[PDB]
């Protein structure tokens, strides 16, 4: 799936306009919470490296870390969801446009299919 | 004599871990022992270029 050459793709657009037709991630998304947790860990490590009280050295600095991580994580999640939606849309369109390559398998019940039986002895 | 020393302490140790250590140590000594002479490295590069031109086409 190389979608760099996908037709009608603006080069340096992070989020295209059609991406606005997709539901945005909730602000309580677990991935957003993980990004905020990553920011908090970055703040704790920053306090530790500089030899400061790890938990209660800079509250403004840790808040900025968490906020920036949440911001970037929200936008990254939007882009990821859009990209996966594009992949699914292309796959479904290709399947619809090539009926001869994806035939409907005949439904066959297990009562009429002969499977070899291997005893456990 | 057999279960503890001969097999467990010697041969089962000789096969998997000791042979691996010996082979890796020998290969590391062979690869890393370069005298830092760009003449040898350049000759090797020329040999590799000729080999790839004569092999991958």
């Amino acid at each position: 799936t190389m979608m760099s050459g996908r037709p009608g793709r603006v080069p340096l657009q992070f989020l295209p306009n059609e991406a606005r037709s997709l539901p945005p991630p909730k602000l309580t998304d677990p991935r957003l919470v993980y990004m905020g947790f990553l920011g908090y860990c970055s703040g704790l490590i920053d306090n530790a490296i500089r030899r400061r009280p790890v938990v209660s050295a800079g509250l403004h600095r840790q808040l900025l870390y968490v906020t920036s991580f949440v911001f970037f994580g929200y936008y990254l999640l939007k882009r990821q969801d859009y990209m996966y939606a594009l992949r699914d849309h292309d796959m479904f369109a290709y399947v619809k446009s090539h009926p001869e390559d994806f035939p409907e398998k005949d439904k066959k019940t297990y009562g009429e299919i002969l499977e070899e039986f291997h005893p456990v002895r | 004599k057999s279960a503890s020393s001969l097999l467990d302490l010697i041969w089962l140790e000789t096969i998997l871990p000791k042979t691996t250590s010996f082979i890796q140590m020998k290969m590391s000594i062979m690869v890393s022992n370069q005298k830092g002479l760009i003449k040898l490295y350049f000759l090797s590069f020329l040999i590799t270029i000729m080999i790839s031109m004569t092999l991958f086409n």
């Binding site: 799936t1 050459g5 369109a93 | -």
Partner: protein, 70 residues
Amino acid sequence: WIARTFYDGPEKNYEKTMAILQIEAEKAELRLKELEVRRLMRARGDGPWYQYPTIDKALIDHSPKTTPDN
């Protein structure tokens, strides 16, 4: 008392398992279909995927060129 205060009935787990099985089955079929679609698109190239660039024809100059035969 234990069943009343701590656990629920079997229908809850039964139907949750049915929903989970449905989701996982659909995911597996989608994975196989995506693999087949990727193979076809890379082999043939008529799909939106694997579209390598080609020289734009808007760069060509269509004018007399000081010689009648171009």
